[PDB]
Design a protein around this ligand. Structure first.
Ligand code: A1AGG
Lengths: 306, 306
């Protein structure tokens, strides 16, 4: 029996119309053109043989408006004249003389651990694929990014409003990925320098494991549900010692509890038991806990509720 | 011997000139006036009788520009006419007919656990005090806020640029505080609703304990330094077992290591030993580890390095 869950991304057309190529010096990558602004990673300014220890303040000083070449290849091609340049954290903010006529309604937001967002993977200003990821508790994502992908963007959507939350910057030693928010901060404690960096431990996202167990119940799979319960406070004490995030309930989780008649505290108890082993059984085709589906994913994909 | 460390805030004058009072119906709090925008917490729209589960989308639709009353009290008083209103996350963005003539150079940024920022505490649009806090690992601050303080702002400063990072929203059960970033997200998993919320465990901020031990050494207090070392990898495994954040070194910590001649790993070992007990001894007047001073504080206040 199939769960009815897939890795679901937003439709990407609105964001496709905002992608451009940015070239500076010897480097090229992707940028995001919104209104009269093009956003891109600041390491486009770095000579390839200095990415280990750049002085970004000095690099920026050394640039003029004409140092940046901005090209839209998709749809109606365009070359955008840069009339101002600025740095915000790890991003460049290039002002251009033409407002993107396809700018969608949008905001900038930061994504939190356990939350899902959609990525539009781009190369040379050309979108090539889309996928969805969950921000991990150690502020990496398990993405799929190759050389030239920097400046690819991640986003959520509320109604018709695109909430941009991620701009790709780098790949870590363990194959995971991280990037910037559009306030210019890197996620987590990472820095946009080409050096090996301390990686924090990952954890299971407890809220998402609960959502997945609710998805199992919604599919008729509930052998792991017992009358036994673990309080949220007791679970969160246990989580600290056992590689789980602390559980914080939400209206989305509550909706799943009401629809199934299974209390959150029953599933917190179940998680504690399942973490010691599934004992030969499967849940939705898995023998390990799944934390890559959110409560919102389960509500939307199984119940049609947004 | 006094360490030379105090809790140091930025001079507040530039931010004082941006504070206003925002009133909606019978609710009032503070806002931040930059250019033609006033930022404030969206719960100013909520009747005191409905704060437990507000329908903020419906509340926003019910408002008109005339629903909001904005006054500047400090300096040259002004009554500011609202000409547009919108909501971003947990903040309102009110457009006013006058641009703040004292708008400083500014950006919006998010602050990370362990980082310090300055707070300007305001009541009824009038600044009353300033203090500094570190963002705790559980995304609370140990502040000093009473009824009417919402909309008080926190910020850092780089050169002449004010980086706004915090707008005050709420007090938690244990007396700590939290708020929003100016992308409208609440810090942590918190929600701007008047209901009990799960409080995540706090942790010691390792990078700041290291800074404080370097401050001790700079002041001639180094009895806890041994040849013994703990690697960053080993310490971080220990940290997860002992309620400490994982350590991620920075250029600022590195400068302290060079100035004192003591390696980070020697202090990581010392922390492990001191956490089991100071053995009746004191460090900079303390019998417990201190994590409220950053590496930058130590560099700036003791060595004069910004
Ligand atoms: C805004 O000025 C004000 C600032 C508060 C007031 C006291 N000190 C502060 O820092 N903020 C609010 O009034 C909040 C409004 C929400 C965001 C809609 N509410 C708030 O801070 O409530 C605090 C109280 C006391 C401690 C606590 O837990 N709560 C929430 C309600 C509660 C739930 C369960 C158990 C006990 C209390």
């Amino acid at each position: 029996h199939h769960s009815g869950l897939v890795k679901m991304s937003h439709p990407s057309g609105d964001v496709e119309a905002c992608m451009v190529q940015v070239t500076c010096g010897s480097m090229t990558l992707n940028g995001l053109w919104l209104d009269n602004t093009v956003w891109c990673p600041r390491h486009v300014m770095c000579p390839a043989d200095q990415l280990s220890d750049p002085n970004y303040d000095a690099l920026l000083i050394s640039m003029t408006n004409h140092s940046f070449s901005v090209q839209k290849h998709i749809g109606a091609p365009a070359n955008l004249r840069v009339v101002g340049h600025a740095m915000q954290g790890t991003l460049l903010k290039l002002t251009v003389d033409v407002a993107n006529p396809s700018t969608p309604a949008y905001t900038f937001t930061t994504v939190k651990p356990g939350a899902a967002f959609s990525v539009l993977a781009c190369y040379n200003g050309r979108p090539t694929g889309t996928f969805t990821v969950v921000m991990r508790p150690n502020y990496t994502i398990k993405g799929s990014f190759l050389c030239g992908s920097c400046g690819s963007v991640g986003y959520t959507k509320e109604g018709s409003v695109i909430n941009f939350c991620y701009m790709h910057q780098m790949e870590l030693a363990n194959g995971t990925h991280t990037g910037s928010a559009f306030d210019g901060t890197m996620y987590g404690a990472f820095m946009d320098k080409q050096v090996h960096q301390v990686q924090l431990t990952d954890k299971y996202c407890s809220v998402n494991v609960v959502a997945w167990l609710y998805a199992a119940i919604l599919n008729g799979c509930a052998w792991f549900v017992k009358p036994n319960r673990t309080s949220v406070v007791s679970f969160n004490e246990w989580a600290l010692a056992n590689q789980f995030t602390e559980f914080v309930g939400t209206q989305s989780v509550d909706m799943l509890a009401v629809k199934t008649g299974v209390a959150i505290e029953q599933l917190l108890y179940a998680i504690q038991q399942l973490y010691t082993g599934f004992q030969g059984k499967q849940i939705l085709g898995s023998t390990m806990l799944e934390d890559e589906f959110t409560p919102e994913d389960v509500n939307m994909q199984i119940m049609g509720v947004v």
